[PDB]
RNA sequence: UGAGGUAGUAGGUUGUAUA
DNA sequence: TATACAACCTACTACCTC
């Protein structure tokens, strides 16, 4: 009557060669494979942009729960998890003034090109002309950029 | 996996050993099962 | 979609790693709306946002969460995506590459350098671009692991047609096969549950014929005790469109190609990486003016 | 080296039956490892049995 | 664009058969 | 160079969140 067959399900392979099914069940046992020292980050946005990462990251930094924790398991923590620092204290900021912006923005073809190219020289200036060392860099998108 | 249990010392030959040599959840796991059913005691998002 | 892909393109340009975040994933409860309800409620997936971010951030930082062990040692995936651009109407083909060898460890990458095709349908290659395409491919594998690989495991959304696989065999070195395998999402099968109320769990498979099948990749999933998908999970068609494999094998690999997924934190996808991963790089390539050789790393472009 | 003759007894009886089979025995041109006449003095005491 | 999915709405190419 | 039809292909908006 049209038997079905059956596939397993792959094994994915975690630190200390250890296997599991679900990434973030062996990422809260074991860890992640290889070890980068820290995140040094950069944030290009307004000062409330700045406020609001901050207080994302200090959020991040202890363990968070959801409603059920069977079908999305828990958060141990940023460093208890992954085992690096990425903390608020080291932050290479790049302020974008309200100005800027509100005689900026206000063809919805012309603009879009604009504001990348403000968020794009900002980036590409600090990364040439400065001697601090950023990995990510992080793009805090206001409210009125994407409607 | 390398050590065979035909190779132990004369010590603790006699005794069953957890298995931990394919995952170490399941060997943790039997460790938890075994403990509960001893009653060793322990103290408490456990 | 402008901002975002014009922006990740004209960085591509200097390989700076990037992350946009909109002010109201970060901050929801502040964005109040239509009397003090969030326009979107993280109230109780707050856990799953941090995870997703925090995976995000490592992976674009340097570093590997995790990887894959049960793959088939000696193959090369390639996934192949076609993106129309109407700016005359060509059609771009960008790929990504995925092989393990040489200490179990899996080498994600994209192939890039986008071949055109100048017919307003016709998603296919022509003999030059399918020839530079596999020469690329194989001369990376065999930097990589200091010889050619024994097989080369082809799969696309769309078909070959005899001049491609003409082309590719002409490349193709004296002791490497090709498969071609196409991924048909939207066929309209349902294999509803009789009894229960939940629906059919993932995994299950239907060999309609030796060179066709049917997978179940969404649906419910033991461990978690709840669904990957919403109403009734809708399967993929699997086609051994040219070459000589067995349909056990192309499964098995299916499934390991949607186990990994590196922009987010999940138990598995729907549809393989591969696939969405070089469509992420097609919208990113087609969305810029000109590169004359585009960075293969995955964090500039995810 | 498969030459000796392993015997096991009982620590405080059972103790002159196996003397007297280890004297016997090595009498009669065997070779014989007993807990009583050999294993030294200032030995571990389990190792060197197994 | 933190992500996943389900649907809807539009078009287009090929293959006959026509004029 | 178009009317009608099967078989495939992509591209947007809008709504949920287990
Ligand atoms: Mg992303």
């Given at each position: 009557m049209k038997e079905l067959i059956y596939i397993e399900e792959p094994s994915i392979l975690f630190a200390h060669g250890q296997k599991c099914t679900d990434p973030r069940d062996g990422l809260a046992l074991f860890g992640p494979l290889?070890?980068?020292?820290?995140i040094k980050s950069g944030v290009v946005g307004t000062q409330k942009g700045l406020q609001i990462f901050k207080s994302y990251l200090d959020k991040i930094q202890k363990p968070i729960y959801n409603?059920?924790?069977?079908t999305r398991p828990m958060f141990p923590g940023f460093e208890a998890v992954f085992g690096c620092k990425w903390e608020s204290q080291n932050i290479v900021f790049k302020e974008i003034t309200d100005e800027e912006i509100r005689r900026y923005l206000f063809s919805t073809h012309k603009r879009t090109y604009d504001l990348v190219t403000l968020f794009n020289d900002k980036i590409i200036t600090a990364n040439k002309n400065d001697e601090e060392r950023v990995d990510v860099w992080f793009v805090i998108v206001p409210e009125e950029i994407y409607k | 996996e390398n050590l065979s249990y035909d190779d132990i010392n004369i010590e603790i030959v006699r005794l069953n050993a957890i298995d931990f040599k394919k995952s170490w959840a399941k060997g943790l796991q039997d460790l938890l099962d075994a403990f509960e059913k001893q009653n060793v005691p322990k103290k408490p998002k456990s | 979609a402008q901002f975002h892909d014009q922006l990740k393109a004209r960085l591509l340009e200097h390989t700076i790693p990037t992350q946009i975040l909109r002010e109201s994933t970060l901050?929801?409860?502040?964005?109040?709306?239509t009397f003090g309800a969030?326009?979107?409620?993280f109230s109780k997936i707050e856990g799953h946002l941090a995870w997703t971010i925090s995976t995000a951030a490592y992976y674009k930082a340097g570093g590997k969460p995790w990887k894959l062990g049960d793959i088939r040692p000696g193959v090369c995936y390639l996934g192949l995506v076609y993106k129309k651009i109407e700016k005359n109407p060509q059609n771009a083909c960008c790929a990504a590459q995925m092989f393990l060898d040489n200490g179990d460890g899996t080498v994600f990458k994209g192939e890039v350098g986008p071949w055109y095709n100048p017919?307003?349908?016709?998603?296919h290659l022509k003999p030059k671009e399918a020839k530079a395409l596999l020469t690329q491919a194989l001369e990376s594998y065999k930097e990589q692991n200091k010889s050619y690989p024994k097989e080369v495991f082809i799969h696309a959304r769309t078909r070959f047609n005899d001049e491609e696989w003409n082309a590719f065999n002409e490349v193709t070195p004296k002791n490497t096969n090709l498969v071609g395998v196409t991924i048909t999402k939207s066929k309209p099968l349902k294999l509803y549950k009789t009894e229960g109320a939940f629906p059919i769990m993932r995994g299950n498979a239907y060999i309609v014929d030796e060179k066709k099948a049917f997978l179940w990749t969404l649906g419910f999933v033991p461990k978690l005790?709840?669904?990957?998908?919403?109403?009734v999970p809708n399967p993929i068609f699997i086609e051994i469109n040219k070459g000589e494999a067995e349909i056990q094998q192309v499964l098995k690999d299916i499934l390991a190609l949607t186990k990994?997924?590196?922009?987010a934190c999940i138990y598995?996808?729907?549809?393989?990486?591969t696939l969405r991963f070089a469509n992420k790089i097609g919208e990113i390539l087609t969305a810029?003016?000109?590169?004359?050789t585009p960075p293969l790393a995955f964090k500039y472009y995810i | 080296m498969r030459n000796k003759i392993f015997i096991s007894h009982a620590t405080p009886e059972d103790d002159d039956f196996t003397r007297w089979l280890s004297l016997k025995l090595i009498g009669l041109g065997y070779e014989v490892w007993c807990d009583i006449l050999f294993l030294?003095?200032?030995?571990?005491?389990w190792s060197t049995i197994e």
């Open positions: 290889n070890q980068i020292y820290g409603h059920n924790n069977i | - | 901050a929801w409860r502040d964005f109040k709306n969030p326009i979107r409620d017919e307003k349908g016709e998603y005790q709840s669904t990957l998908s919403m109403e990994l997924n590196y922009n598995a996808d729907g549809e393989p990486v810029s003016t000109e590169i004359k | 030294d003095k200032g030995v571990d005491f």
